[PDB]
């Protein structure tokens, strides 16, 4: 061995295990699911109680960027907040020196080249999080981006990340997010979240749903409560 | 063969070799992909795939072909996060020489700028050194068309055509017997030994929604990409 | 970020310094070079093959001039060659910038070994893979230098560097004397470089640079075939 | 102080005067004031004339520099670029007043530069202190696309106003021809003003001064 | 990047440190230079390495340098070091000439280099040098003096040494053959020839093989000249004409 | 093989900041006791050589009027926390024209106890003893290498630290006077060094709240020991 | 002003295969002298000397600073220097402070080295150099040195004639200045030997 | 910047660099220094010198002022580099304070210019143990010493080096008061002491004395000769 200690060694056949070990810890957080609809981005996160002494709204895996631009995060936690304080400062200095409300592909571009930068050098490690990025303009769509801990990124459809993401993402082609609005798809990311995440594992879980589109005005915000009751109300007949 | 940490950073082996640059050679190939560029009488063509394996994924944020210059694009072998990043020093570059000197930079002096960045690499014992390649593409004036190739070790050359990738060996033995017998090249030609080099090797006979064709020519120095309507067009027409 | 701050070349317990003694066996593994001085100019000459038909031989120079009168081509690895050619550039131009006069060719070499000798002891590099041949017509008299990674440098009149190096130098002794003209030396350059060629040395295998009293120039292909005309 | 220069048919010639006068005292009287920059470009000179001759050689430097680089021939709007990002840096504190012309592969090019980095590209300019005569002979007598035998007529024309006009100018006319393949520096182009003969001997013999201690050291 | 760190200035356990004593012992090997003086007169006889018959022979010397206008000094070890150690010392002079406006003692020269040698090998984490070298020169506090510098960055005036390959042999030999005081300036030369014959075993004493420089003093010039290839050859074959005779009249 | 010198432990502590802990095992023993009518501190010198001068080594120092030390561990790095402690006293004088209090003065020495790193390089091996009288009466503090300061009442320090800490525990009530406080020390010391008590092995120095710093010396310290 | 503090002279002269060189001796502050040997020629090697006039400080200074520079050249290269390389290391010296400038114009004279041909050169404060072939002037009594030498100069003189020139027009000129004088040393130099001589002004 | 611990502690407590640092000054040459109550005497043993070379450059003992001495052991090239750190310090002192500069003072510098250094980055301790000595104001005759890893601390007698501890034995059993009676008479105790050390027969010996009003004067080889006389036939009459 030895080749897999420092970020910048190559093996003897040619790749970078620092980075692949990393890869590695994301597949214990749990699953984040985030798919875009004719005119906006749904994003969704079951989330795991832990113990019954937590808060209900505590440490949140699902942030918010900028004014229209959303983020959900599956990782370890600790390092998904710190990529999101740069995020939300590299768009806050766009705006400052360009006057305009910072687009997707670039944001995207920004954020992994800072991803990147930390997989070339012994002084630090590559970070443990995978994350997604979505939002909508009235001038561009909807936009949905997703970045490994390696730095790339690509588009979208529709994308998945935790434990089971080959187990989330079989589901999600199901579906026809070309035609559908984002009223409809709020029951559709419930439900196929449902289906996975036995509670042999778990023995209770938390939905936590997010929203963005014209019908936000283009604005992010979470769901309202009555809405991701209905997808709740919508829960219990996936056992038919 | 090996003598101290000569297996894990850039230093001198007992046999004069220097072994984290010929590991980061075969770092290239684990994309599993393989571009070709074929310089013609009066044009360029660079040919490359895309291997798009999901229909949740946006199939137009794929593109493996940038446009570094208004006048100069290139292609991008290796891994994608360290690709990516080579292509936003080049961008800065020959923005730099415009300001500088007042004039579009020649392609041959900007393929200098990179090979000298990424001769740094191969020479402080503390970074890594950039596993992927290089092929940039334009027009020159009282030179025509030339095409240049960057690796990873700081060395590069014109050359008359050019393969990259997985495939790169048995590519360079077509194109060799196809160059000298000396048959003379039109537009039209030089785009299809250029594809019919990569249909031979890999043996796919495509459809045209797996490759991307990048073009300059002195007629219109702008370097564009075809779309797949009239990629079809020179697609049925090899077909005879 | 930041550095490393330590030397990685240290002394042997047999009192060798093992990185220089490494980084001299990549310089024997380089191409063949040879370099003649004959009481008027120098010749320069070097052997450039490429691997394939593909590539275009007219794109890069293994001679390279550093001002009008000094030229410079190396036996080593290709990327740290292009690196101390354009400080080479630079230092030719700052003492050009002091004195108003075309620097000497002995200082040149001064300032072209004390970068390579300070690269091969500071923090978190290892030394460079090449060695140099330097020409060179100041005050009449012409010049013939030669550099190694360790930064030390001689004053030949006639050397050969690169793989069989040992087998020209022995050749050179027997051919070199002190009284020839600069296309004498033409002929006896080629003459050692066939000694280790493949089988067609044609004008596009080698690439020789001459000076004169009028200059470091290099040659074209054209007359480069006519001296490879009649050789041998 | 009087430079100037013309855009002719084919090439570029620029003219001088040869006289620096330190407060109202003439110092030299055969100042060259036309510099080299590159084999195809000159440039000509006026203002604090230590200034000049220090930003002249910075720039030429520098494009031999880039030119060995690139390995093909400068550009004159390269030493345009290079000359006013550098003058605008120093706040016009460096006081240098240029006339700048070469023929690079997209042709003649006549620029001038002010110190404090406002450029622009004419086809005649005059610079220096008897700028004003020499515009007034450009300005009534210039044509475009002239040869090369009525562009040197013209442009020694020019200076000589500048001669018998300024105080502070007037000696031997300089003059360079720049064109496609040809360059033609020649400094004494024409002699309007000689100096007088001497008339009463003054000469004195060895032994008219008085000294008080002499010392030999010998040489070898 | 603590695991690559190699340790260059820590002690070792039996007291000692083991990094310049590698440097004292590739002191030993690849060079010969030696010294004495007894009178008006100090000279420096240095060994050629490279006598391969294809070299210019230019630069005016090879192994000596001229530091000062009224010093010089011979090197031995590693040459590329030996470079950097020259025009080092050779601006402290300089610098000294600036701020006192008078020619330096040469003791204090020695002192000036010795600390800027003993730093290396004291903090830093880097590569001592790998270089002794000798002193000569005038002054007006003491005359002629002679001195000897180490790696590891202690000097020590002496009147005869030499650091080459058979140094040992050769120092065994020097305080054989002497007189304090008395040696003038033909003496030791003709002690120079005779050292330097049995230290080199290249036998016969090709006249290209060595070097000798002297520095004299006359009146205001305290004159520093390397003695030509013409006058070498006539002094060894004066070495080789009494060596006949004392050998066959014993 | 080598850490780094910040490095924590799979039990979870540190390695040098434990190490540091074994070094003051190897100074010499030294007492202190808190009594309500004032500070009693007493040290040995552990006299090697005949030839050695036992005055010019010390433990006992004063870091204002009011407040006294004594040192434990190594020696030569103590002097660094000395000369720190007696600057932050002169600089709350300075700024506030009142003297800073006796705990005050222990938190501004161990805040530098933990800094050392690989920016801007190992901890203190030593140990102290803090005595001194403030406005809430006479106080008695020991700091660690670790940084940790805590109240004693009666601490003893050193290299028989826990055969003096049993023997203390026994002795010590909250009804003290100090003239006993003095002897019941010197008992304890005694006991624990290795040769025989004289007025040249030891010193002593008390704090009241009434006069200021004062150190015994040579002639009325053997009083006690005559009368021990 | 500044360069008249201290006053000072300094003239040079091309002869045929020779080249002379004149200064005056008096150093003093604005009306009052204080000592009548003040050097202001300085030797750069044989056969190539340099006269500073301007302000005492900076005399001294910068022939102090020369010196430093040039002993390294002529060690780190086997050769003396060329005439026509140390003006171009003098103009390097000056124009480093563009804004802090030393107040001092040099002079320099000298022999060419291999080809014995005269030279002469002189510099304003902040390094424009200007070569000529028959004299050049420094210091505070310019104006009166032109009226000399623009009425005594021949073309082709012997050093005999070169040093009755320079002789007269310093003992003429000096005179009529008020803040120069009080005595003039002449260096002329020349391929075989070289001569320095004091002539008999006045002390007045 | 080399930013690096190099001593750190050991798994029982102790400092390796520094224990190995006080072994290379138990290998240098002995050097022995006593104090009287007018005139103070020391003096290296093993001067070891060629016999036919310089001997003014090998000096030892050298003075830091016009009033304090030092000798000391150990590796001579990290020894004068702290000399002439002290010889700034007590130069500095003069232009704040205005007496010269006490003893006890200029050892407090060298002890925290080496502790501090043991402490730093990149840095090997120092090599070296001295022997400060001197008469300070009002006529107080004192000496001191320093350890590598720097805790100055006063004596009587002392003795550094190699075979220090079979000396410092033998000054023990020796030094009594009426042995510093007279000004010749201390010089013998030291004379007795070096030759029961490493060979010392009087052409390796090199004294040097100081009246608390003078400079250092050595003695040449002649009282050395001659105290060594009389020492011997001292001991040649009583045994």
């Not at chain 2, 894990?8 to 082996?13: R, Y």
């Not at chain 5, 070792?12 to 090997?29: D, F, K, N």
């Not at chain 5, 010093?71 to 601006?91: F, H």
């Not at chain 6, 002097?79 to 402690?85: E, N, P, Q, R, S």
Request: glycine share 8%; net charge negative.
């Amino acid at each position: 061995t030895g080749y897999d200690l420092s970020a910048s060694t190559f093996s003897p056949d040619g790749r970078v295990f620092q980075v692949e070990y990393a890869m590695k810890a994301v597949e214990n957080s749990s699953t984040a699911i985030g798919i875009r609809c004719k005119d906006g981005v749904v994003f969704g996160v079951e989330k795991l109680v832990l113990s019954k002494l937590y808060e209900e709204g505590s440490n949140k895996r699902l942030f918010n960027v900028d004014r229209h631009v959303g983020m959900a995060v599956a990782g370890l936690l600790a390092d998904a907040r710190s990529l999101a304080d740069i995020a939300r400062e590299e768009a806050s200095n766009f705006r400052s020196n360009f006057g305009y409300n910072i687009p997707l592909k670039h944001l995207a571009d920004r954020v992994a080249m800072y991803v990147h930068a930390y997989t070339l050098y012994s002084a630090v490690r590559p970070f443990g999080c995978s994350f997604m990025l979505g939002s909508y303009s009235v001038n561009d769509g909807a936009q949905l981006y997703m970045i490994d801990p390696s730095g790339v990124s690509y588009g979208y459809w529709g994308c998945a990340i935790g434990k089971a993401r080959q187990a989330a993402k079989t589901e999600i082609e199901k579906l026809q997010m070309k035609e559908m609005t984002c009223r409809d798809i709020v029951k559709e990311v419930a439900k196929i979240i449902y289906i996975v995440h036995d509670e042999v594992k778990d023995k209770a879980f938390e939905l936590e749903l997010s929203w963005v589109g014209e019908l936000t005005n283009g604005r992010h915000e979470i769901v309202p409560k009555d809405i991701r009751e209905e997808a709740e109300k919508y829960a219990k007949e996936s056992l038919k | 063969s090996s003598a101290g940490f000569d297996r894990h950073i850039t230093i001198f082996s007992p046999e004069g070799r220097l072994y984290q640059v010929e590991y980061a050679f075969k770092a290239i190939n684990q994309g599993g992909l393989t571009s070709v560029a074929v310089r013609g009488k009066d044009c360029a063509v660079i040919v490359t795939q895309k291997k798009v394996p999901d229909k949740l994924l946006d199939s137009s944020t794929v593109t493996h072909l940038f446009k570094i210059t208004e006048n100069i694009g290139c292609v991008m072998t290796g891994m994608t996060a360290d690709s990516r990043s080579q292509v936003q020093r080049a961008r800065y570059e020959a923005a730099n020489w415009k300001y500088k000197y007042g004039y579009e930079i020649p392609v041959d002096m900007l393929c200098k700028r990179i090979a000298d960045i990424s001769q740094v690499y191969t020479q402080n014992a503390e970074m890594r050194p950039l596993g992927c390649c290089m092929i940039l593409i334009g027009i020159d004036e009282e030179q025509g068309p030339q095409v240049y190739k960057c690796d990873p070790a700081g060395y590069y050359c014109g050359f008359k055509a050019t393969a990259a990738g997985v495939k790169q060996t048995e590519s360079t033995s077509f194109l060799e017997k196809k160059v000298k017998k000396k048959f003379d090249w039109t537009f039209e030609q030089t785009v299809e030994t250029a594809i019919t080099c990569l249909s031979t090797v890999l043996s796919i006979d495509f459809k045209p929604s797996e490759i991307e064709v990048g073009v300059v020519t002195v007629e219109n120095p702008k370097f564009r990409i075809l779309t797949e309507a009239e990629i079809d067009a020179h697609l049925v027409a090899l077909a005879e | 970020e930041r550095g490393y701050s330590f030397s990685l070349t240290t002394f042997s317990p047999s009192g060798k310094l093992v990185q220089i003694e490494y980084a001299l066996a990549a310089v024997a593994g380089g191409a063949p070079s040879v370099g003649i001085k004959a009481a008027n100019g120098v010749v320069l000459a070097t052997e450039k093959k490429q691997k394939s038909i593909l590539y275009d031989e007219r794109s890069v120079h293994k001679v390279e001039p550093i001002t009008k009168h000094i030229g410079l081509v190396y036996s080593g690895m290709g990327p740290d060659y292009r690196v101390l050619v354009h400080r080479a550039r630079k230092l030719a131009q700052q003492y050009y910038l002091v004195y108003q006069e075309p620097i000497p060719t002995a200082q040149l070499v001064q300032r072209v070994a004390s970068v390579m000798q300070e690269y091969t002891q500071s923090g978190g590099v290892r030394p460079f893979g090449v060695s140099l041949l330097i020409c060179g017509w100041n005050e009449g008299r012409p010049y013939l230098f030669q550099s190694d990674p360790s930064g030390a440098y001689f004053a030949w009149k006639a050397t050969a560097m690169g793989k069989n190096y040992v087998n020209g130098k022995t050749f050179l002794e027997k051919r070199y004397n002190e009284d020839l003209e600069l296309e004498d030396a033409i002929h006896t350059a080629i003459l050692t470089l066939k000694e280790s060629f493949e089988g067609q040395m044609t004008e596009d295998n080698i690439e020789v640079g001459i000076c004169n009293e009028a200059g470091f120039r290099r040659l074209t292909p054209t007359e480069v075939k006519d001296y490879l005309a009649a050789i041998a | 102080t009087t430079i100037a220069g013309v855009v002719y048919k084919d090439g570029i010639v620029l003219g001088a005067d040869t006289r620096a006068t330190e407060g109202m005292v003439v110092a030299d009287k055969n100042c060259s004031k036309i510099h080299f920059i590159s084999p195809n470009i000159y440039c000509c000179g006026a203002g604090t004339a230590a200034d000049t001759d220090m930003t002249t050689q910075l720039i030429s430097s520098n494009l031999e520099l880039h030119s060995l680089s690139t390995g093909r021939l400068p550009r004159v709007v390269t030493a345009n670029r290079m000359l006013k990002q550098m003058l605008f840096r120093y706040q016009g504190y460096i006081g240098a007043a240029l006339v700048l012309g070469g023929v690079d592969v997209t042709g003649p090019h006549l620029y001038s530069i002010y110190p404090h980095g406002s450029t622009d590209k004419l086809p005649y300019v005059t610079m220096g202190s008897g700028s004003l005569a020499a515009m007034a002979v450009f300005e009534d007598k210039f044509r475009p696309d002239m040869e090369e035998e009525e562009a040197k007529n013209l442009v020694s024309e020019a200076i000589a106003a500048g001669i018998f006009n300024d105080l502070g100018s007037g000696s031997n006319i300089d003059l360079c021809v720049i064109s496609k393949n040809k360059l033609d520096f020649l400094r004494p182009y024409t002699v309007p003003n000689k100096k007088g003969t001497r008339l009463g001997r003054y000469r004195c013999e060895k032994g008219t001064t008085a000294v008080l201690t002499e010392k030999i050291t010998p040489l070898e | 990047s603590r695991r690559y760190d190699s340790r260059t200035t820590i002690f070792s356990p039996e007291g000692r440190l083991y990094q310049v004593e590698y440097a004292m012992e590739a002191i030993g090997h690849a060079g010969t230079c030696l010294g004495i003086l007894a009178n008006d007169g100090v000279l420096l006889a240095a060994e050629r390495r490279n006598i391969h018959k294809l070299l210019d022979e230019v630069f005016f010397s090879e192994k000596i340098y001229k530091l000062n206008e009224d010093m010089a000094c011979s090197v031995a070890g590693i040459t590329s070091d030996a470079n950097v150690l020259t025009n080092e010392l050779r601006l402290i002079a300089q610098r000294y000439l600036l701020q006192y406006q008078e020619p330096i003692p040469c003791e204090q020269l020695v002192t000036a280099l010795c600390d800027i040698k003993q730093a290396y090998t004291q903090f830093g984490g880097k590569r001592p040098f790998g270089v002794s070298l000798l002193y000569i020169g005038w002054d007006k506090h003491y005359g002629f003096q002679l001195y000897q510098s180490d790696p590891s960055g202690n000097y020590g005036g002496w009147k005869a040494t030499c650091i080459g390959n058979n140094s040992a042999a050769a120092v065994s030999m020097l305080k054989q053959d002497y007189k304090e005081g008395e040696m003038t300036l033909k003496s030791a030369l003709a002690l120079a020839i005779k050292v330097l014959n049995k230290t080199m075993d290249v036998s016969k004493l090709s006249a290209e093989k060595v070097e000798i420089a002297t520095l004299t003093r006359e009146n205001g010039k305290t004159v520093i000249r390397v003695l030509k290839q013409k006058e070498v050859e006539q002094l060894i074959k004066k070495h080789e004409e009494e060596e006949a005779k004392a050998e066959r009249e014993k | 093989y080598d850490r780094g010198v910040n490095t924590f432990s799979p039990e979870g502590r540190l390695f040098q900041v434990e190490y540091a802990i074994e070094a003051i095992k190897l100074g010499s023993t030294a007492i202190g006791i808190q009594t309500s009518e004032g500070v009693c501190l007493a040290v040995e010198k552990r006299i090697t050589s005949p030839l050695m001068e036992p005055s010019s080594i010390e433990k006992i120092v004063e870091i204002d009027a009011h407040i006294g030390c004594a040192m434990s561990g190594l020696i030569a790095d103590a002097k660094t926390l000395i000369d720190k402690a007696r600057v932050e006293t002169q600089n709350h004088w300075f700024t506030y024209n009142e003297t800073m209090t006796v705990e005050s003065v222990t938190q501004a020495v161990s805040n530098l106890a933990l800094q050392f790193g690989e920016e801007d390089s190992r901890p203190f091996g030593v140990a102290l003893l803090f005595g001194g009288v403030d406005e809430k009466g006479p106080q008695l503090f020991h700091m660690d290498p670790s940084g940790t300061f805590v109240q004693c009442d009666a601490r003893a320090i050193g290299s028989a630290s826990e055969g003096a800490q049993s023997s203390l525990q026994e002795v010590y009530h909250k009804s003290m006077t100090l003239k006993e406080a003095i002897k019941s020390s010197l008992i304890i010391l005694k006991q624990v060094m290795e040769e025989k008590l004289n007025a040249t092995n030891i010193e002593l120095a008390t704090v009241q709240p009434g006069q200021n710093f004062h150190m015994f010396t040579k002639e009325e310290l053997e009083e006690v020991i005559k009368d021990i | 002003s500044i360069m008249s503090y201290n006053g000072g002279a300094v003239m040079a002269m091309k002869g045929k295969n020779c080249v002379a060189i004149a200064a005056d001796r008096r150093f003093g502050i604005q009306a009052q002298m204080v000592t009548t040997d003040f050097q202001k020629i300085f030797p750069m090697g044989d056969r190539l000397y340099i006269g500073l006039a301007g302000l005492a400080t900076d005399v001294q200074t910068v022939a102090q600073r020369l010196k430093f520079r040039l002993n390294l050249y002529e060690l780190k290269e086997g050769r003396q220097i060329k005439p026509y390389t140390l003006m171009s290391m003098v103009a390097n010296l000056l124009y480093e402070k563009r804004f802090g400038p030393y107040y001092t114009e040099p002079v320099i004279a000298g022999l060419d080295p291999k080809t014995f041909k005269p030279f002469i050169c002189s510099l304003d404060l902040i390094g424009c150099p200007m070569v000529t072939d028959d004299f050049v002037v420094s210091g505070t009594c310019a104006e009166q040195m032109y009226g000399m030498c623009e009425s005594l100069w021949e073309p082709n003189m012997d050093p005999d004639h070169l040093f009755e020139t320079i002789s007269q027009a310093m003992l003429n000129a000096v005179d009529r200045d008020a803040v120069s004088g009080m005595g003039v040393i002449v260096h002329i130099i020349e391929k075989d030997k070289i001569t320095t001589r004091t002539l008999k002004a006045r002390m007045d | 910047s080399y930013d690096r611990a190099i001593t750190v502690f050991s798994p029982d407590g102790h400092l390796f660099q520094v224990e190995y640092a006080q072994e290379a000054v138990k290998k240098g040459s002995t050097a022995v220094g006593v104090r009287g109550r007018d005139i103070v005497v020391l003096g290296v043993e093993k001067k070891s010198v060629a016999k036919l070379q310089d001997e003014r450059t090998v000096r030892k003992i050298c003075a830091l002022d016009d009033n304090v001495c030092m000798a000391f052991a150990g590796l001579t090239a990290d020894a004068r580099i702290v000399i002439n750190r002290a010889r700034v310090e007590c130069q500095s002192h003069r232009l704040t304070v205005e007496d010269p500069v006490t003893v006890e003072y200029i050892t407090r510098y060298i002890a925290s210019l080496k502790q501090r250094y043991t402490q730093s980055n990149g840095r090997r301790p120092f090599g070296i143990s001295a022997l400060i000595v001197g008469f300070d104001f009002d006529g107080t005759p004192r000496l001191y010493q320093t350890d590598p890893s720097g805790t100055y601390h006063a004596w009587k007698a002392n003795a550094i080096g190699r075979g220090a501890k079979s000396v410092r034995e033998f000054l023990e059993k020796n030094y009594t008061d009426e042995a510093i009676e007279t000004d010749d008479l201390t010089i013998k105790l030291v004379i007795k002491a070096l030759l029961e050390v490493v060979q010392s027969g009087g052409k390796n010996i090199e004294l040097a004395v100081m009246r608390r009003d003078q400079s250092l004067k050595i003695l040449n080889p002649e009282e050395i000769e001659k105290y060594v006389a009389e020492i011997e036939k001292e001991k040649e009459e009583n045994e």
